[PDB]
Amino acid sequence: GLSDGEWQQVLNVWGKVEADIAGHGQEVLIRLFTGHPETLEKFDKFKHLKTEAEMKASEDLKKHGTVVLTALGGILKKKGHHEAELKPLAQSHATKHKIPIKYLEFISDAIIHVLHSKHPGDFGADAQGAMTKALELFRNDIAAKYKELGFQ
Numbered sequence: 001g002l003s004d005g006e007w008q009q010v011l012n013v014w015g016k017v018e019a020d021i022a023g024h025g026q027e028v029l030i031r032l033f034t035g036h037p038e039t040l041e042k043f044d045k046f047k048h049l050k051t052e053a054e055m056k057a058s059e060d061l062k063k064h065g066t067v068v069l070t071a072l073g074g075i076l077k078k079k080g081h082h083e084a085e086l087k088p089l090a091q092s093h094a095t096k097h098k099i100p101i102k103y104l105e106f107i108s109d110a111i112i113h114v115l116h117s118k119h120p121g122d123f124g125a126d127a128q129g130a131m132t133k134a135l136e137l138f139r140n141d142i143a144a145k146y147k148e149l150g151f152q
C-alpha cells in the first residue's frame with residue numbers, strides 16, 4: 001500500500017499526463033507494441049500496423065491510447081480503492097481478450113518509460129518509485145482475479 005505522500009506524487013505526475021493525454025496515450029502504446037511485438041498481435045484492430053510511422057499516423061490508436069490512460073487515471077485517483085474496476089477489467093482482459101498478466105507489466109514499464117521521457121524534471125527516482133508501486137498494486141489485485149478465473 002502506498003503512503004499519502006506516495007499517492008500525492010502519483011497524482012502530481014498524472015497531472016502532466018492530463019495536459020496531453022492523447023500524446024501520452026499514443027507514445028505509451030507505441031512503446032509497448034514496438035518493445036514487445038507479441039502485445040500488438042493481441043489487438044485485432046491494430047495488428048495491420050507494421051511500422052512506427054503507421055502507428056503514429058493511426059488516429060484510432062491515438063484515440064484508444066486516450067481511452068486507456070483515462071481509465072488508468074480513474075483507477076489511480078481511487079488510491080487503491082478500485083475494487084469496482086477489478087472484476088470488469090480482469091473479466092475483459094482475461095476472458096474476452098486473453099491478455100497475460102505479463103502484458104500488464106509491459107504496459108506499466110511503457111508508462112514509466114514515457115513518463116520519464118517527458119517529465120525528467122518531475123519524475124525523478126522517488127516519483128518513479130511511487131508510480132511503479134501504484135501500477136504494481138493494481139496489477140497485483142488483477143492477478144488475484146485472473147487466479148480466481150483460472151486464466152492461462
Ligand SMILES: O=N[O-]
Pocket residue numbers: 064068
Ligand atoms: O490498450 N489497452 O487496452
Ligand SMILES: O=N[O-]
Pocket residue numbers: 071089
Ligand atoms: O474502460 N474502462 O476500463
Ligand SMILES: O=N[O-]
Pocket residue numbers: 031032035106109110111113
Ligand atoms: O517499455 N519499457 O521500457
Ligand code: NA
Pocket residue numbers: 088089090092093
Ligand atoms: Na473493461
